[PDB]
Amino acid sequence: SKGEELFTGVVPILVELDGDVNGHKFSVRGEGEGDATNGKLTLKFICTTGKLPVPWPTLVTTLVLCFARYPDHMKQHDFFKSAMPEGYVQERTISFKDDGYYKTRAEVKFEGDTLVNRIELKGIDFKEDGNILGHKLEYNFNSHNAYITADKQKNGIKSNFKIRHNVEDGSVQLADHYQQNTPIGDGPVLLPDNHYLSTQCALSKDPNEKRDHMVLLEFVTAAGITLGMDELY
Numbered sequence: 001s002k003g004e005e006l007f008t009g010v011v012p013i014l015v016e017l018d019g020d021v022n023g024h025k026f027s028v029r030g031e032g033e034g035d036a037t038n039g040k041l042t043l044k045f046i047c048t049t050g051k052l053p054v055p056w057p058t059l060v061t062t063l064v065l066c067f068a069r070y071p072d073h074m075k076q077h078d079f080f081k082s083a084m085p086e087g088y089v090q091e092r093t094i095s096f097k098d099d100g101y102y103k104t105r106a107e108v109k110f111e112g113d114t115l116v117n118r119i120e121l122k123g124i125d126f127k128e129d130g131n132i133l134g135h136k137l138e139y140n141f142n143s144h145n146a147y148i149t150a151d152k153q154k155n156g157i158k159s160n161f162k163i164r165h166n167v168e169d170g171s172v173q174l175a176d177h178y179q180q181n182t183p184i185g186d187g188p189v190l191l192p193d194n195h196y197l198s199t200q201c202a203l204s205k206d207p208n209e210k211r212d213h214m215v216l217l218e219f220v221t222a223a224g225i226t227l228g229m230d231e232l233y
Contacts, residue, residue: 001188003084004075007036007066012114013043015063021123022100022133024053030063032216034115036081039069039221047212054123055137056214057165060201061177062092062104064117068197068220073227077192079150079157079181085110086185088156094163097174100126109184131165131173138166141201146177147224150191156182157192195224 015030032043045056045063052059066080080088087109094102106119126133146161163175183189197220204215 001082001190004078004081006084006110007034007081009037010035011067013041013064013117014111014114015043015045015117015119017059017063017119017121019054019059019121019123021054021102021121022126022128024133025049026053028052028059028063030216034064034067036067036069039067039219041067041216041218041220043216043218044206044209045214045216046209050212052212054132055135055165056139056203057137057141058094058096058102058132058175059121059214060141060203060216060218061094061163061175062102062106062119062121063216064108064115065090065197065220066108066115068222070222071227073231074195074222074225076190077195077222077225079148079190079192080108082188082190083181083183083185086183086187088181088183090179090181092180093178095176095178096126096130096132097176099130099132099173100124107184131167136168137173138168139203140166141203142166143198143200145196145198145223147194147196148192149194151180151182152191154180154182155189155191156180193225195222197221198223 017028030045070078159179165173
């Protein structure tokens with residue numbers, strides 16, 4: 001697979017989400033670019049339907065792991081780029097402790113020169129004045145490591161990880177993520193050995209933007225695979 005050759009430069013990104021949480025419907029559109037050589041994402045997201053009925057941090061994980069920086073000695077473990085340009089399906093259940101859950105299905109694939117992430121999200125069983133529908137979470141996103149494992153019986157990968165959202169009173173809201181990715185095309189994909197992605201996020205606002213929005217700078221770097229001494233020649 002020569003999919004990783006599509007990420008050697010800076011690649012434009014389009015994100016489209018349609019969401020429905022407890023019947024509160026919304027849409028999000030994001031645009032920016034990704035620089036996989038540095039593991040860098042820079043995106044700005046707009047809620048095109050007005051007010052976002054959930055906190056922006058709860059959508060960060062849903063809103064393009066093909067831009068992770070895989071170190072040279074781990075390039076053979078990069079499922080996400082190997083599926084390109086045809087892409088992969090990314091499905092999650094995100095269970096908020098003591099509250100509701102999101103179900104998401106996304107297609108991540110190239111459309112022309114642009115990497116597109118197109119998502120359908122459904123949220124169920126939320127408390128209308130819980131931390132999510134009640135907008136009680138701080139506008140930030142802690143650094144976090146997500147373990148990747150191969151899912152050979154589906155020709156893809158899976159991952160489980162806990163996101164810990166800061167609550168405005170000082171408590172923590174757990175978002176338990178269960179994730180599965182499977183290729184869209186029939187070409188060859190890389191099934192990785194066990195490793196993890198290390199992610200840092202900086203969330204900001206655009207001063208000249210009146211719509212409900214999120215400016216996002218994110219770094220994703222792969223790690224956790226023993227870089228031995230044979231790989232030195």
